């Protein structure tokens, strides 16, 4: 079983680029991170920051999650992110995505020891 901390890193971290490299970034990344294996994941966000800066968010401001849970944390700085949304003509197994770049505060839910992000909750 992949851990929840490892799954967050696979689904949401891209420390290798400062921002989406092209309008095909999401098509490429949703495939290579295996987010289209048995269905098209309808939306996803990648964070273009170091793993240490995103893990640090779990020590920053404690806030409510989108669903009202209270183990969420909001980043002190805005972070570079890419939002991936499935296109209307996308049809598993042939998944297609629109790439949109943003720079926003991120909110993540954290768990565990070590206490790390296990869920990307929102950008604000």
């Amino acid at each position, epitope marked *: 079983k992949e851990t929840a901390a490892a799954k967050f890193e696979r689904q949401h971290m891209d420390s290798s680029t400062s921002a989406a490299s092209s309008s095909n970034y999401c098509n490429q990344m949703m495939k290579s991170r295996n987010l289209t294996k048995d269905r098209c994941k309808p939306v996803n966000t990648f964070v273009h920051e170091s793993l240490a800066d995103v893990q640090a968010v*779990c*020590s920053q*401001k*404690n*806030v*409510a999650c989108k669903n009202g*849970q*209270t*183990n969420c*944390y909001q980043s002190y700085s805005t972070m570079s992110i890419t939002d991936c949304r499935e296109t209307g003509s996308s049809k598993y197994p042939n998944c297609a995505y629109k790439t949109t770049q943003a720079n926003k505060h991120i909110i993540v*839910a*954290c*768990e*565990g020891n070590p*206490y790390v992000p296990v869920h990307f909750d929102a950008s604000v």
Partner: nanobody
Amino acid sequence: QVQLVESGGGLVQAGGSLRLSCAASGYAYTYIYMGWFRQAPGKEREGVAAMDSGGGGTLYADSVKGRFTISRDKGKNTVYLQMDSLKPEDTATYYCAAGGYELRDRTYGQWGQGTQVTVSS
């Protein structure tokens, strides 16, 4: 550095009462949930009581309902546990925790060093 400073607890006779206290220092914001967990030797850590910073969302383990009472100073990072009618099975190390949700220990990221509570017979 955040420090959760716990006080109180210790040795008491079965049937007796004790209070535990915990004040967080070093955190620049408000922890929405704080709580009390406990672990006996050899057993898994268990949530005892938790409360949110508005004085609501109060939750207790079934085995302490009616006997234990949690409280916080409204809007601040302090939490207290009054324990009455103590039983030998309440003997454990008790931990304050901050920053999680309800009684789910995996969600809490800041932990006190732990305070022994010993209930004798």
